[PDB]
Write a structure and sequence with these properties.
3 domains; disulfide bond; binds 2-acetamido-2-deoxy-beta-D-glucopyranose; binds the ligand OC[C@@H]1[C@H](O)[C@H](O)[C@]2(O)CC[C@H]1N2; binds calcium ion; signal; binds a molecule of 2 linked components (NAG-NAG); 8-stranded parallel beta barrel
């Protein structure tokens, strides 16, 4: 009926901000080679204040060289004694975010770890000081090399925590003058972290925020008792159609209302990874075509704006928030300066499903909502109105100001299903607009890269999406013909988050490709036991990279070759001997058309008219037999979709 909004009995919890995740894993991979101005425009839609999603929080993966959902991300310490703070693209992304929003909040969190941290075990808690040292060096490097202040450091994404590790991490941060860095734990479920904090005063002292993943808007009693800030430190992960916007809309309000969570952070920030990788197009917007410049400002961007443009971290929720009589919810916030923001959502069940969890049916129907401003809100003769209707549709439209000048501090509105209203004293709102970007286009059907770049802007050549191992631009000054190559740089299995393959692999191109010729120069660095491959029709990647089938053309340093149907090498198409050794360059060609494949070694047929599965489709790929050094040069692909 009537809903009272008031602050005379005090405020709710402090609001900590809305954010998104770049990482877990390689979700921003394809953003870095967007041409200008589109790349800058994408970033404006994400981070520019009073424009698009206007995000308050950016959380990034701390790469550990393992597969972490849509690819690998490179570590700052590939090996013991190795330190490099310029690999990958999270440094670049954090700086671009800070340029747009100097007050953006920065978080880092590991998914995988370089294998050498485990000292012979796939376990990061073998040497607590060593793992803490590794993580803290990332934070120091962020400051020393990029002028980035990391505000929050997590533990181990969706993996066990170790209470002694968390304490050592606090001790190490303090030892390095990083008292201001806060710890969030444990980026998994509410338990066991929540009860651990009630039982261990020392643990309680060093954990600042309980961060839980996909809580379905609820928390648990132990977490409320702790007194700690509670965050949905990872949510969303739903395709960014209108359904995902509805999911984002509902949980943004109800994570606080139902579970006292004062921050929600969406996985992921932007869908800049091939769509047929796991969880495709599950970013706040889509930018997965750097070759064309095409991107899509999806509905979740404007759902975000309904909160972010009219709140800031440090505002406070009112005590008077809740659900509507006939479905939906409302929150309200103030900044203690006379501003008020009211956010109303009526997302229907059929149109707001997240992937995790699935809610049983709830009803939503037309209703009239009356709001009355009591307490300090009593003045406020006017409020600005921003409106979105999902599903068709209209996004983030500014409507006529509502006037409360009748002395009652009261208004009403006709709500229907799947709407968002933001009513605010703030006058800074804006629906940012750039002109439309180029039309969508498939990955180029002829594509080449000679890797000849002496000072690359990023550590890896464009469009190559590593799915196990790490491939990087490599300069060999002791050579003239292959001075600039692409090298696989892992020499041992990471402490894995995913089930990384036993072979390294980087995929590129158009997943719909069915007939293709792939060519590449390859160089095997390990004598006798080394091996490399080129492939096509590679059908799976990311978390499922172990499952990948296709056509794989292997050569080995013992003078042999293999043609397999699977990355694991269990299914043989052909095999035989080849004039192949380590430490010399060979040019591999693989042609796949219809039912048949052929392979050439240095332009001479090695095997031909070999029967392969068909129909079949997938990316092109390169890689190495195990975690071993190898180089690649003069990559070429021609394909038909
Ligand atoms: C966390 O939020 C819950 C609600 O989601 C608060 O719970 C009680 O909620 C009912 C109705 O939902 C109110 O009538 C009670 O007054 C609330 N309890 C109290 C003590 O006020 C709960 O208070 C919140 N916990 C915090 C802020 O620590
Ligand atoms: C609403 O918010 C704005 C921005 O936070 C407030 O205006 C600022 O007020 C502070 C002092 O309170 C000044 O130092 C800033 O220069 C102001 N900035 C802008 C952009 O105006 C405003 O006071 C708040 N209250 C109301 C009723 O608007
Ligand atoms: C990929 O290659 C196969 C084999 O050449 C193509 O299939 C043939 O297409 C022709 C003309 O379209 C037909 O007359 C044949 O009967 C097809 N054969 C088979 C076995 O399908 C296929 O169309 C090609 N696809 C692309 C996208 O180029
Ligand atoms: C939802 O509520 C309305 C109003 O009470 C009712 O008419 C309608 O049948 C309900 N729908 C479901 C699926 O419960
Ligand atoms: O929905 C998938 C999500 C994504 O893959 C993130 O990497 C993760 O941390 C791991 C699973 C979940 N959260
Ligand atoms: Ca080269
Ligand atoms: Ni497919």
């Amino acid at each position: 009926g009537a809903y009272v909004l008031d602050d005379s009995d005090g405020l709710g919890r402090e609001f900590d901000g809305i954010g998104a995740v770049s990482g877990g894993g390689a979700t921003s991979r394809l953003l870095v080679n967007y041409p200008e101005p589109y790349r800058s425009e994408i970033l404006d839609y994400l981070f520019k204040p009073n424009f698009g999603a206007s995000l308050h929080i950016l959380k990034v993966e701390i790469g550990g060289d393992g597969q972490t959902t849509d690819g690998t991300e490179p570590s700052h310490m590939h090996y013991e004694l190795d330190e490099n703070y310029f690999r990958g693209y999270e440094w670049w992304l954090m700086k671009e975010a800070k340029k747009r929003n100097p007050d953006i909040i920065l978080m880092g969190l590991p998914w995988s770890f370089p294998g050498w941290l485990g000292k012979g075990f796939s376990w990061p808690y073998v040497n607590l000081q060593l793992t803490a040292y590794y993580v803290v060096r990332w934070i120091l490097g962020a400051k020393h090399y990029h002028d980035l202040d990391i505000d929050y450091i997590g533990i181990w994404n969706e993996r066990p925590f170790d209470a002694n590790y968390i304490k050592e991490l606090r001790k190490m941060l303090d030892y390095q003058g990083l008292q201001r860095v806060r710890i969030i734990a444990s980026d998994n479920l509410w338990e066991p972290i929540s009860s651990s904090l009630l039982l261990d005063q020392e643990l309680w002292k060093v954990v600042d925020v309980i961060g839980a993943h996909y809580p379905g808007t609820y928390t648990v009693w132990n977490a409320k008792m702790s007194g700690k800030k509670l965050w949905s430190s990872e949510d969303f992960s739903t395709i960014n159609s209108n359904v995902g916007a509805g999911c984002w809309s509902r949980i943004l309000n109800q994570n606080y209302i139902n579970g006292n969570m004062t921050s929600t952070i969406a996985w992921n920030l932007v869908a800049s990874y091939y769509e047929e990788l796991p969880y495709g197009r599950s970013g706040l917007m889509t930018a997965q075509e750097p070759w064309s410049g095409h991107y899509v400002v999806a509905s979740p961007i404007w759902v975000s704006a309904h909160t972010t443009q009219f709140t800031q971290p440090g505002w406070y929720y009112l005590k008077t928030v809740g659900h509507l009589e006939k479905g939906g919810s409302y929150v309200a916030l103030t900044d203690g300066l006379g501003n008020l923001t009211i956010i109303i959502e009526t997302m229907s069940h059929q149109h707001s499903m997240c992937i995790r969890p699935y809610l049983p049916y709830y009803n939503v129907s037309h209703q009239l909502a009356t709001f009355t401003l009591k307490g300090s809100l009593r003045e406020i003769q006017e409020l600005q109105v921003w409106y979105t209707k999902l599903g068709q549709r209209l996004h983030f439209k500014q409507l006529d100001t509502l006037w409360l000048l009748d002395g009652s501090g009261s208004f009403t509105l006709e709500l229907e299903e799947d709407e968002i209203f933001t009513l605010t004293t703030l006058t800074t709102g804006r629906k940012g607009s750039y002109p439309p970007p180029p039309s969508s286009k498939p990955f180029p059907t002829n594509y080449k890269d000679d890797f000849n770049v002496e000072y690359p802007l990023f550590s890896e050549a464009p469009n190559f999406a590593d799915q196990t191992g790490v491939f990087e631009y490599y300069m060999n000054n002791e050579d003239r013909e292959h001075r600039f190559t692409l090298r696989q740089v892992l020499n041992q299995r990471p402490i894995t988050w995913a089930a990384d393959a036993s072979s390294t692999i980087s995929v590129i191109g158009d997943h719909h490709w069915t007939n293709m010729t792939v060519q590449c120069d390859v160089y095997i660095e390990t004598p006798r036991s080394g091996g490399v491959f080129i492939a096509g029709r590679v059908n799976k990647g990311g978390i499922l990279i172990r499952s990948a089938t296709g056509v794989f053309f292997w050569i080995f340093a013992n003078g042999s070759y293999r043609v397999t149907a699977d990355l694991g090498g269990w299914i043989t198409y052909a095999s035989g001997h080849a004039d192949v050794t380590a430490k010399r360059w060979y040019t591999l060609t693989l042609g796949i058309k219809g039912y048949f494949a052929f392979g050439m070694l240095n332009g001479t047929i090695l095997w031909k008219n070999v029967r392969v599965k068909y129909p079949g489709h997938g990316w092109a790929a390169i890689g190495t037999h195990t975690f071993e050094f190898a180089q690649f040069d003069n990559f070429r692909v021609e394909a038909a979709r």
